[PDB]
Amino acid sequence: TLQDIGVSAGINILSAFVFFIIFAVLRLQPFNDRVYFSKWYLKGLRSSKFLNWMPEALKMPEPELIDHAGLDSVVYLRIYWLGLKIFTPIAVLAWAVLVPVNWTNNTLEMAKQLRNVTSSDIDKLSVSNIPEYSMRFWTHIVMAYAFTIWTCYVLMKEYETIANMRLQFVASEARRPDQFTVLVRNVPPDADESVSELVEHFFLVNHPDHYLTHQVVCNANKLADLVKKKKKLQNWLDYYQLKYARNNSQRIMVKLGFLGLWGQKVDAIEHYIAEIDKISKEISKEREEVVNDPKAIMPAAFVSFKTRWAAAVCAQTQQTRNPTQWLTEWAPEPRDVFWSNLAIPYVSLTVRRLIMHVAFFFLTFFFIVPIAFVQSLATIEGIVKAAPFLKFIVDDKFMKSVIQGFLPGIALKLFLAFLPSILMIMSKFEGFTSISSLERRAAFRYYIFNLVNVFLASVIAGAAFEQLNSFLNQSANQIPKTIGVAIPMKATFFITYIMVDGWAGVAGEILMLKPLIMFHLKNAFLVKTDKDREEAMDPGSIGFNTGEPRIQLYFLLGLVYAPVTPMLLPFILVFFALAYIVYRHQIINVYNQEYESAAAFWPDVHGRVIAALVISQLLLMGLLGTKHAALAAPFLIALPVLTIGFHHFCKGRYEPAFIRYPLQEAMMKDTLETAREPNLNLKGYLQNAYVHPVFK
Amino acid sequence: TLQDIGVSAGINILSAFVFFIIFAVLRLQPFNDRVYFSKWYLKGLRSSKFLNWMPEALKMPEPELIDHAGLDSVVYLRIYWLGLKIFTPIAVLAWAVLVPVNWTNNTLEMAKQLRNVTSSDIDKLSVSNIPEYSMRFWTHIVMAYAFTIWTCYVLMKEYETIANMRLQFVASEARRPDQFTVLVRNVPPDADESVSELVEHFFLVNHPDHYLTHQVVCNANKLADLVKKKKKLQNWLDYYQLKYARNNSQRIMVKLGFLGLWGQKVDAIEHYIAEIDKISKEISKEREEVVNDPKAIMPAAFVSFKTRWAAAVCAQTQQTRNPTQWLTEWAPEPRDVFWSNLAIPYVSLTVRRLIMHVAFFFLTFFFIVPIAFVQSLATIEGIVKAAPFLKFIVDDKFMKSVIQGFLPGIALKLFLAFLPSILMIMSKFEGFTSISSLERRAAFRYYIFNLVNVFLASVIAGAAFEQLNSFLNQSANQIPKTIGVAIPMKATFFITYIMVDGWAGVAGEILMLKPLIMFHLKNAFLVKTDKDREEAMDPGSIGFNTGEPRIQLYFLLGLVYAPVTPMLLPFILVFFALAYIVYRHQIINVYNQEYESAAAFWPDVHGRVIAALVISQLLLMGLLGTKHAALAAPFLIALPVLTIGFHHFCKGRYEPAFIRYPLQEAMMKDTLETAREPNLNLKGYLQNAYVHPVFK
C-alpha cells in the first residue's frame, strides 16, 4: 500500500515543516526567550532563512559540549549518531543487493522509472514462501552475516570511544562531594549504640588512616510532604489573591477544586490562610519532633574519606561476612540522591522488586487490547458503523488512506503518552536512592515493554487478526508458521508508525509546547514578583527514560527488517538524522541536567543493541526457515552465538571502565588535587553535604 | 532384564568384598605400613572383624579433620554426604508413590512377594506412552516439584554451611605468605626500566603506606627441565648400577629403552655417567646464564604488603584504566604455584583457551565411537563372530548376562581411565598458574565431557542403535520423539554402569594398587639409602578433578531417573555411602594435600548440581510430553525458571564468601596477629618466598 505510505509521508513532512515554522516564529518573538533558552540562564550567560538553527547546532564542538552541558547529554547525542553509523552502510548494502539488483546505473537520476511504484508492499516472494537453495537464501545468509558483523564492529568502536571519554572526564572533573562519599546501606542494628556511633566505630576500625566523617540518613519524609503541601497551598493562595485583586467586586470563591465541587468552601482566601497557618504550625512541630526523634534514624549513612583512593577502596570491596549488611557503594552527588526512597528498609526491596515484576507483567499484558485496537484499526476497517455517514466531513480514497495509515500511528502514540510516567512511578515506587538509577530502570522497563508489546504484539495481532480473521481456537496446528508472511505487512504498518512517532514527534518536540504553556500560565497567574521568573524555569532533563527506549525500538526494528524488507531503513535514517539535529539544538540551548553520572548508562545501551541484534537474527531464522530448515539453521544458529560471544568480549574489555574505578586514577587525582590546593579543608567541605534538602 | 542386574550386582558385591579382604590382609602385613598410612608420616606422627576400619573412620570429628587434613578434604567428604542428604528423601518418596503404591504395609518384611521380580525393566507405561491427564501425569508433576524443592533447599543449607566453615577457617588459619602476596600479571613493558623497577614504582605510588616488597617472575623453564632430566638420569643410573652390583659377572647393557632398541647403547653405566656429567655442566651453564639474563624476566611479579587488609584491597580492585594491564589477583601459596605456566605471555592465553575448546570438542566427539562400541555391546550382541565357539571357556545364559551387563560397564570404565590425565594435560597446557585452578578446570571439563558423552551419547546411541537398528537416513521425521521410550532401557544399562564404576571402583580404590606397586618397585630397585624411603612417599591429593565429576554424573543420573524409574536410586545411595566411608578413611590415613585453597571450589559444585537439576527437569518435560504437551508444559516450564532463580539467589547471597574477602575480616586478622606477635619481622618472612623452587 504505497499510496498510504505516500499520503502519510506527505502529511508528516507538512506537519514537521509547520512545526518548524511555528518554532521559528515563537523563538524570534522575544517575551518567551526565557523558555527557549533555558540554558545560558541556569548557568549565568544571558539575561533579557527560518530554519537556519541547524547549521549553528553543529558548531561549538564536542569538547565544549562536554564542558558545557555535561557528558551524559553528549553520550546521548552519540547514541543518536550511532544509529546513522550502524544503519547507513546496512541500508546501502541492502538496497544495492537484496530487493533491488541495481547497484550502480546512474550517478544523477531524479525520478525512478516504475521502481516499485506500483506495489511495494509484497516482498514476501522468497523470504518466507518459495525456497531457492541457490541464490536468494544465500543472499539472505550473506546479508545477515554482513549486517551482524558491521553492527558489532561499530558497537565495539563506539564502546571503546565512550569508555575513553568517560575516563578522561572523570579524571578532569572538578571536586564534588560524591568523589569522597560512600553510601552505606543496611547498617546492622545495635541496642546500646546508635547508627551514628556504629558507623563511626566501624569506619574508624576498618578504614583507620583515611576516614573523615559520616552523615546519617534521617527519615524526614513526613516533613518533606508537609513542606510540599505548604508550597502548593502558597501557590493556590497567591493565585486566588491575584484573581480577587483583578476584580475586587468579586464574590466568594468555589468549593473543592476537581471533586465535582463536593465541599462548600466559601471565601477561599480566608480558608487558604487558615490552612497555610495550620500547616505551618504542623511543620514547626514536625521539625522539632524529627530533629530529636531517635526512631527517625534509618540504618544508613553517608561516609566521607580524606582521599578518593580510600572512597574507591571502600566502594568496591566487601565490608563484612554478611553481604546483606554494610552495603557499601558510591554515593550520588547530593542533588542526585532521591531522599524519599532512603526511608525504605533494605529487607523490603526484594519483595518490592517482585511486586514491580508482577505489576509490569499485568501492565504489558493488559495494554495489548489498546494495541490490539490499534491493529484492528490497522487492518482494513470494514465496520463503517463508527463513521457511517460523516467520517469528519466527507469520505474519500484519501480518507481511507488516512484512517488506515495515519490513525493507527497517532492512536498508538497517544496510548504511549503517559506510559513513561507510569513506568517512572513504578520504578520510583521501590527505592533506587538516585535519580540516575531511577531513569535507567525506567528506560529498561520501557524498552522491555516496547519490544514485547508495541512490536511483537502488533505483529502477532496484525497477523492473527488479518489472516485468522474469524476462525476457532485450534491448538495443535503449528501456529508459529505464518509469521513469515505476517511480518512485512506489519512493516507497512511500521513505516507509518516510525514516521509519526519519529519525524513528526521530534519536530513537535522542539516546539516545547508543554513547557511554553506551563511557563506562560505560571507567569500570568502566579508571578507575584519578577525575581521568581527564574524560579519558574525548569527545562527538565534530556529525558533518558523516555527518549532512549524509542531509539532502541527503532534500532531493533531496522535490524529486524533489514534482511526482509529494506524499504524500512531510509525512514529510520531520516529519524536518526532529524532526532540528532533537534536534540543537539536542545542540548545546546535548553534541557539543563538533573544529575551528572558520566555515561554510566552506556553499558545498558550497548547491551540492548546487542539484544536487538540477537532478536533480529532469531526472527530471521524463524521467518526464512518457515517450514523447511533449508540448511540455513546450521548458519543462522551461528550468528546468535557469535553475537553473544562478541558481547561478552566487549563486556569484559570495556565495561570495567564504567563499573569499576581504577585505583591509579584515584591516586593521581588525589595527588594533583593536593599539590594544586595545599591548604584545602576537606572536613569543612564534606561535613554538611548529604544532610537533607529539608533541613536547609 | 532383572537377571542381568542380579548377576552383575552379585559379582560386584563379591568383587568389593574380595577387595576389602585383600585390603585388610595387606594393611595388617607390616612392611607396607609406609604406604597405607602416608599421613601421620608427612606430618610427623608415626614411624616404623576384618572390615572394622569403618567404625573408626567415623571418629576423630569434623573440627579435628579440618585441623588435620585441611578443609578441602572435609568439604569434598561433605560433597559425598550431600548426595545422601539429597537422594534419601527423594528415593523414599519415589518408591512410596511413583512405581510402588505401597507406602506402609509391614515394618519388618524380609522377602518381597513378586514385587517386580518378573520384569522390572519396562516402566514405560505412562511416563512416555499412554496419557492419563487424571492421576499419573499429576503424580509426575508433584514428584518433580517435590524433588526440585527438596534438592534446592538442601543445596541452600549446605551452601550456607560451607560458606560459614570457609570464613571461620580463613579467619583461624595460620600465617602463610599468600595472605599478604598478590600476583600481578601482565605488567606493561617499558624501555628504560625493568619489570622490577616498574613494579616498585607503581606499588610505591599507588599503595604507599602498605607496600612491602616484590619478587619478580623469572622464566626458568629450561633450567627446570634440565634438572628434571638430571633426576631421571640419576634414577636410571642408580637402577643400572644396582642391577650390575647384583650380578658383577653381567655383560654390557641394552640400547635405547622402549624405541625397539633403536640405538646400540653399550655398557649403559658409562654412557649414563657421561650423560649425567654433560647435563650437569649444562645445568651450571644455564643457571649462570639465566641468573644474569634480562630477557628471562616475564612481565609478572609477586607483590607483598605489610597487612592482609592492603593485600585484599589490591587483589579486589581495578588497578589501571586498561583492564588488560596490571592484572591483580590473590597469589597461590608458593607450593601451589604452577611455575611452568608463569612463562606464558598474557596475550596468548585467549587464543589458547579457544584451542582447548576446539580440541575438547574434537575429543568429546571422536570419543563417541568407543561409547558407541560400548552401547553396541550394551545392545543384544548378535554377531557371535567375535566369540563363536569359546566365549572364554563355555557359553551359558549367565555368560550372556555377564557379557550384556558386565562387559559394557568394564569397557566404558577402561575407556574412561586415561581421560582424567588427558583433560589435565589439556588444562595444564594453557596457563592457570596454580594447581588448584588446574584441578578445578579439569574437573569442569570432565563434568562437561561426562554429561554430554557418557550419559547423553549413550542414551542416544542405545536408542538409535536398538530401535533404529538398520534404517536409512531420514531427516524430516521428528527424530526426538522416541527418547521417552528410549531412556529407561538406558536406565537398565546405567544400573550396571553405576555398580561397576561405583561400588567396585571405590572398593578397589582403597586397595591403592598403583601406589603400592610403584612404591614396592621403587623400594626394591632404586632405594640406594634408607633415608629415601620417605622421599618415595607421595600418596597424591584427593584427586578432585577425577573424583568430583563422577559424583556429579551420579547426581545428574539419579535426578534424571527419579521421576521416571526410581529403581535407579538405591544403587546411587549405596554408591554415596560406600564412597563417603572409603574416602573418609583415605582422608584420615592417606592422601596428603598438594594445596590449601579453603573450599574455593564449592561454588562450582553447587552450580553443577543446579545444572543437573535443570537438565533433569528439561528431560522430564521432553519425555513426559512425548507428542502431546498434556498441559504439563505450563508446569514443567516453571521448574527450570524457579531453579535458575533459586540458584541466582544462592549465588548472590553465599558466593561472596567464596569469591570476595571482606575487609573487616582482614583488619581483625591483622590486629589480632600484630597484638599476639609484636616483634614480627614481616619483610624477612616474605622476601624470599615466591622466588622459584629451582633457585633453592
Across the interface, whether the CB atoms of B656 and A323 are under 8 A apart is answered yes
The label of the residue with cell 519425555 reads B623
Whether residues B397 and B473 share a domain: the answer is yes
- Strand duo A181-185 + A297-305: pairing: antiparallel
Across the interface, whether the CB atoms of A317 and B312 are under 8 A apart is answered yes
Whether residues B538 and B436 share a domain: the answer is yes
The label of the residue with cell 650423560 reads B275
CB A332: neighbour CB atoms within 10 A? 22
Instruction: Give the chain B residue whose CA is nearest to the CA of A202.
Output: B664
Whether residues A631 and A653 share a domain: the answer is yes
Question: Which grid cell sits at A231?
Answer: 508550597
Task: Find the CB nearest A662 among B316, B318, B657.
Answer: B318
The label of the residue with cell 578397589 reads B508
Task: Find the CB nearest A318 among B209, B319, B661.
Answer: B661
Asked whether residue B210 is assigned to any structural domain, the reply reads no
Asked whether residue B40 is assigned to any structural domain, the reply reads yes
Across the interface, whether the CB atoms of B317 and A318 are under 8 A apart is answered no
Task: Find the CB nearest A167 among B202, B321, B657.
Answer: B321
CA distances from B268 to A667, B35, B148, B230 (A): 65, 32, 66, 16
b or e along B426-465 (b: 16 or more beta carbons within 10 Å of the residue's beta carbon)?
A: bbbebbbbbbbbbbbbbbbbbbbbbbebbbbbbbbbbbbe
Using an 8 Å CB-CB cutoff, list chain A residues near B316: 316-318
What is the maximum alpha-carbon separation in chain B?
89
Whether residues B425 and B510 share a domain: the answer is yes
Which of A320, A661, A663 should one mutate to test binding to chain B, selecting the residue with the greatest count of B CBs within 10 A?
A663
Across the interface, whether the CB atoms of B318 and A317 are under 8 A apart is answered no
CB A391: neighbour CB atoms within 10 A? 15
- Contacts by residues B626-634 (CB-CB < 8 Å, ≥ 24 positions apart): B626/B128, B626/B129, B626/B481, B626/B484, B626/B485, B627/B481, B628/A476, B628/B131, B630/B131, B630/B133, B630/B137, B631/B133, B632/B137, B632/B140, B632/B141
Q: Among B275, B291, B307, identify where a domain stops.
A: B291
Using an 8 Å CB-CB cutoff, list chain A residues near B323: 652-653, 656-657, 660
Instruction: Give the chain B residue whose CA is nearest to the CA of A164.
Output: B321
b or e along B5-34 (b: 16 or more beta carbons within 10 Å of the residue's beta carbon)?
A: bebbbebbeebbeebbeebeeebeeeebeb
Which of A164, A187, A321, A477 should one mutate to test binding to chain B, selecting the residue with the greatest count of B CBs within 10 A?
A321
Using an 8 Å CB-CB cutoff, list chain A residues near B317: 312-313, 316-317, 660, 662-663
Give how far B340 is from chain A: nearest CA, Å.
Answer: 27
Whether residues B163 and B250 share a domain: the answer is no
Across the interface, whether the CB atoms of B667 and A316 are under 8 A apart is answered no
Round to whole Å and give the CA distance between B595 and B560: 34
Residues A450 and A552: beta-carbon distance below 8 Å: yes
Round to whole Å and give the CA distance between A56 and A36: 15
Whether residues B466 and B590 share a domain: the answer is yes
Across the interface, whether the CB atoms of B657 and A321 are under 8 A apart is answered yes
Asked whether residue A114 is assigned to any structural domain, the reply reads no
> What are the DSSP E strand ranges found in A574-673?
none
Across the interface, whether the CB atoms of A653 and B205 are under 8 A apart is answered no
Across the interface, whether the CB atoms of B653 and A324 are under 8 A apart is answered yes
Way the structure was solved: cryo-EM
Round to whole Å and give the CA distance between A636 and A651: 23
The label of the residue with cell 521417552 reads B484
Total domain count, chain A: 2
Round to whole Å and give the CA distance between A109 and A102: 13
Round to whole Å and give the CA distance between B233 and B273: 9
A11 phi, psi to nearest 5 deg:
-65, -35
Whether residues B145 and B227 share a domain: the answer is no
Task: Find the CB nearest A319 among B167, B653, B663.
Answer: B663
Give how far B421 is from chain A: nearest CA, Å.
Answer: 29
The label of the residue with cell 529407561 reads B488
Asked whether residue A342 is assigned to any structural domain, the reply reads no
Question: Which grid cell sits at A323?
Answer: 553481604
> What are the DSSP E strand ranges found in B97-210?
181-185
Round to whole Å and give the CA distance between A553 and A455: 8
Give how far B318 is from chain A: nearest CA, Å.
Answer: 5
Instruction: Give the chain B residue whose CA is nearest to the CA of A354.
Output: B645
Using an 8 Å CB-CB cutoff, list chain A residues near B312: 317
Instruction: Give the chain A residue whose CA is nearest to the CA of B650.
Output: A323
Residues of B with CB under 8 A from a CB of A: 167, 202, 205-207, 209, 312-313, 316-321, 323-324, 476, 628, 652-653, 656-657, 660-665, 667
Asked whether residue B316 is assigned to any structural domain, the reply reads no
Asked whether residue B326 is assigned to any structural domain, the reply reads no
Using an 8 Å CB-CB cutoff, list chain A residues near B315: none
B250 phi, psi to nearest 5 deg:
-65, 155
Instruction: Give the chain A residue whose CA is nearest to the CA of B354.
Output: A645
Which run of H or of E encompasses B173? Answer: none
Whether residues B154 and B227 share a domain: the answer is no
Round to whole Å and give the CA distance between A279 and A297: 24
Using an 8 Å CB-CB cutoff, list chain B residues near A652: 323
Sheet with strand A211-218: strands edge to edge? A211-218, A297-305, A181-185, A327-330
Instruction: Give the chain A residue whose CA is nearest to the CA of B671.
Output: A205
Round to whole Å and give the CA distance between B407 and B400: 10
Give how far A309 is from chain B: nearest CA, Å.
Answer: 9
Round to whole Å and give the CA distance between B463 and B485: 9
Residues 6 or more apart whose Cβ sits within 8 Å of residue A514: none
Q: How many interchain CB pairs under 8 A, A with B?
A: 78
Task: Find the CB nearest A318 among B321, B476, B660.
Answer: B660
Instruction: Give the chain A residue whose CA is nearest to the CA of B321.
Output: A662
Question: At what angle are helices B544-561 and B71-97 packed, to 10 degrees?
Answer: 10
Task: Find the CB nearest A321 among B316, B321, B665.
Answer: B665
Whether residues A373 and A306 share a domain: the answer is no
Whether residues A196 and A266 share a domain: the answer is yes
- Residue count of chain A: 696
Round to whole Å and give the CA distance between A397 and A393: 13
Using an 8 Å CB-CB cutoff, list chain A residues near B665: 320-321
Which run of H or of E encompasses A306? Answer: none
The label of the residue with cell 579440618 reads B66
Q: Which domain holds residue A539?
A: 2-103+125-174+349-471+480-660
Using an 8 Å CB-CB cutoff, list chain B residues near A663: 206-207, 317-319
Across the interface, whether the CB atoms of B660 and A167 are under 8 A apart is answered no
* Of B548, B352, B529, B367, the residue nearest B444 (C-alpha): B548
Across the interface, whether the CB atoms of A660 and B206 are under 8 A apart is answered no
Whether residues B236 and B159 share a domain: the answer is no
Using an 8 Å CB-CB cutoff, list chain B residues near A660: 317-318, 323
The label of the residue with cell 527488517 reads A561
**CA geometry: angle at B41 spanning B39 and B43, to 5°?**
80
Give how far A261 is from chain B: nearest CA, Å.
Answer: 51
Residues B11 and B402: beta-carbon distance below 8 Å: yes
Using an 8 Å CB-CB cutoff, list chain A residues near B313: 313, 317
Residues of A with CB under 8 A from a CB of B: 167, 202, 205-207, 209, 312-313, 316-321, 323-324, 476, 628, 652-653, 656-657, 660-665, 667
> What are the DSSP E strand ranges found in A126-260?
181-185, 211-218
CA distances from A3 to A380, A573, B212 (A): 14, 21, 78
Using an 8 Å CB-CB cutoff, list chain B residues near A319: 662-664
Whether residues A651 and A667 share a domain: the answer is no
Asked whether residue A108 is assigned to any structural domain, the reply reads no
Which of A309, A314, A317 should one mutate to test binding to chain B, selecting the residue with the greatest count of B CBs within 10 A?
A317
Task: Find the CB nearest B662 among A209, A320, A656.
Answer: A320
Which run of H or of E encompasses B301? Answer: strand B297-305
Give how far B14 is from chain A: nearest CA, Å.
Answer: 50
Asked whether residue A134 is assigned to any structural domain, the reply reads yes
